[PDB]
Every structure is written in C-alpha cells, then in structure tokens.
Amino acid sequence: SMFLPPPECPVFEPSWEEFADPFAFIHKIRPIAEQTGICKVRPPPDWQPPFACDVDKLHFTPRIQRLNELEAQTRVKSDYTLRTFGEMADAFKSDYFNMPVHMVPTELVEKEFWRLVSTIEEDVTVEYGADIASKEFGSGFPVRDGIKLSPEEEEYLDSGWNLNNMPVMEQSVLAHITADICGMKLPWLYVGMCFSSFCWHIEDHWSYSINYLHWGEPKTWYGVPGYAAEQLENVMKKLAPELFVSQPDLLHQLVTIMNPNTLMTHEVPVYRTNQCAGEFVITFPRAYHSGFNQGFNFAEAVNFCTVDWLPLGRQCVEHYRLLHRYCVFSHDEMICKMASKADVLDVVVASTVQKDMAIMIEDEKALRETVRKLGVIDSERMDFELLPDDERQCVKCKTTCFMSAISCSCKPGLLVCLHHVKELCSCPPYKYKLRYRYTLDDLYPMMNALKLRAE
Ligand SMILES: O=C(O)c1ncoc1-c1ccccc1F
Ligand SMILES: [Cl-]
C-alpha cells in the first residue's frame, strides 16, 4: 500500500582479519552480494578513521535538483560553506516535517520521498554537493600534505579502505592506467540533505563502486543485481522512453528517479539498505542503484575494478559499441599497458589479464582478416595512445580505438573501428589504410610475458 520497502540487502561484519585486505574480502562475499547488486559492510568497531574538518573554510558550489519521478536529469559532470549548507539542510528537514531532525523516523522519510516524487502537484527542490577532491574541498580520509598528521591519522593513511588508496593498489586493474581519466579513478565527495537523490544508473564500464558515509544522517539505497540489468532497462524504456533518445556526450547521459515497487511489479529484483555513518556500501558490476539522503550528511565514493571484472569490462565495451555510447578509456589499451608491465604485476592479475588478452588477440585476428577481404591492403603502425581520446573514436559507433582503425586520405583525421569499415567515406577500399598499434608478432610475446609471470 503506497510504499512496500524492498527486502534488505546483505550486511557484512568482517573481523579484523577478513577486513585486512579489501580485495580479498570483496572476493569472498561476491557470490552472495552479486545476487543482490549492493551490499553493506560494517567495519570492525575500532576501525574509526579520524574525520577532521573546519566547516567554515570548506566551500562548494551546490547543484539544484527537482524531485519528479520519471523526469530526465543529467548526470552530474550559489556558493555554500559546509556550515551554511548544513544550516540550510537542517532547517529544511525540520520545517518539512515540523520535527527535530533526528526524530523523523527513516521509515517515514522513505515513504514521504516516494510520495513527493510521484505527486505532480508538489514542486519540491533540493540542493547537494558532488565533486572530486580539490584544494577548496578535499578527501574526508587522511592523505599526505605539508601539514602534520596526528599518530591516529597516520594509522589510516595507508588503509585499504581509505578510498584514496583504493584505485592504486596492486589489485585494482584501473591502477596503472596512466591515461587522464580523472572522473573514474579519483574519489568523489557528496554532501547530502533530506531527499537529495541519485538516479538509477550503473557505473561507467560496469565497474564496482564503494561508498563510505563519513558522518551525518543515513543514506537510503536501492540496488538491482547485475543479471537483471536488461530487465530493468526494458521496464524503463517502456515507462520513460525520453531517457533513451541518443545523446552526443558522455556528459549528456540521461537518468531518472523511479519507484522500486514499479520495478518489483515487473519482476525485477530490488534490494534496499540504510547506510549509516561509518558504513560502506559496495555496488557490483552492472548493478543498478539509486537512493536518497535522509538528511545532512557527507559521503565519499570511488570506482574500482578487480580481476573478476575484466571479462565484464570487455563485454561492456562491446555493449557500448552496439549502443554507440562513448567510452571513458580504451579497455584494450589498458590490457596492453598491463602486459607491457608484466614483470611487476601481481601474479593472479597477470593470469587473468592473459586470459583476456588471448580473447582480444583472437578477436583482432578475425577482424583484420575481414578488413583484408574487404580490400583494405595498405597499412601503417600508429600509436593510438598518443591521440586525445576525442581524436580516436569510431565515427560510427564512437568506440575509442587502440588496437586498430581504418583511415582514408579522403577524410583526413576520421577513423572507424574494424566493425564499421563501410561507414567512413565513399572511396574504394584501396584508398583505405589499416592503422594498427601492434602486429600479431608483437602481441604473442606480450602475452607470453604474462604466462611466465603467472607460471
Ligand atoms: O551516487 C552514485 O551512486 C554515483 N555513481 C556514479 O555517479 C554517482 C552520482 C550520483 C549523484 C550525483 C553525482 C554522482 F556522481
Ligand atoms: Cl513532484
């Protein structure tokens, strides 16, 4: 009636030993959590990272948000201090409910949220902070500067669960990517207020994400396991087709608020949780999620990729191609970068990269055979990684080229991937040129380095 809360997602309480390695722990819980899409992780009770900040010197620019179900919103991509915002946010919640803020039950805020977003009459708008860390506003976790740290801050400086360290460990595949893809591998900071929400979405390249609520009122999450992603997309194509009209930017993707009950009605499994201060939420690959904040709070989140993810990362790029969606980075460029550093790679990493590289190479062999039989004869090596990413997207499917592309003197600067050789210009095939990063004879040694390192 009105709102039936979805079943709770899994909640984990690792001992200090399990909690020690984040990647090991995630791999342990994965068979459970990937069935629900999201899961919650409660750190051991003494794991208590110091949060220190002055609420008066931290400034940020607020984003405005209208709260209407099925209305398109743009993915984030007139100035508050943390104190002035906190004052605005607490006054808002307190006035909305005529209650002291920490007396409004979470049950009620959830019910109320889904009421006001569905009611066309209500014109409720809220504000929020979302930005990567910077000089005006930095990580809520300890980092390193020319200012001195307390002995407890240094304890957490190198933690696995310090989300600054998360991308750059020897088990996050996104680590030794050197490309300038800052939105991806850097932590985002989120200042919430009551009802401020994050629309349904999956992470770029179907990465994991991990979210830490530093302090404040809870955050409410809904999640859908990765296997139900296309079920959910179908439900949303049916009820809100405007979100699916083609967009020209990776910054122009459209997303929306939608009642979990609507999804559950249409046989999509949804799970929920309330994330409280000091808890982590983890989202698995291609797991849809959305939610809202219960009140004033502060969260930090980062994307990451384990070896488990590599095959999905390839399937994701295939899927982007079939959608003509822009990529953040070249998956193949990443694989080859790792292969070229095979001597210093973690050995399970090296084993998994090798399996992905073997698929890459077989697929590339076939594609080159196909363009040869189409009459493309001339060819030259080309260092794709030197090109700005906007200078090496397939003109048809927008995939970021790295292994190979077709060019034509006829249309200077334009490229197509090998799936879209027909789509470049009208010249006969002999005017085309296969531009390639590597010959097959370069590639098999790179793969053998990986096999040696894995043994
Ligand atoms: O909150 C999330 O789960 C999320 N994941 C990627 O982007 C976001 C995101 C959401 C809302 C606002 C800005 C964002 F950046
Ligand atoms: Cl509304």
Ligand SMILES: [Mn+2]
């Ligand atoms: Mn997300």
Ligand SMILES: [Zn+2]
């Ligand atoms: Zn293409």
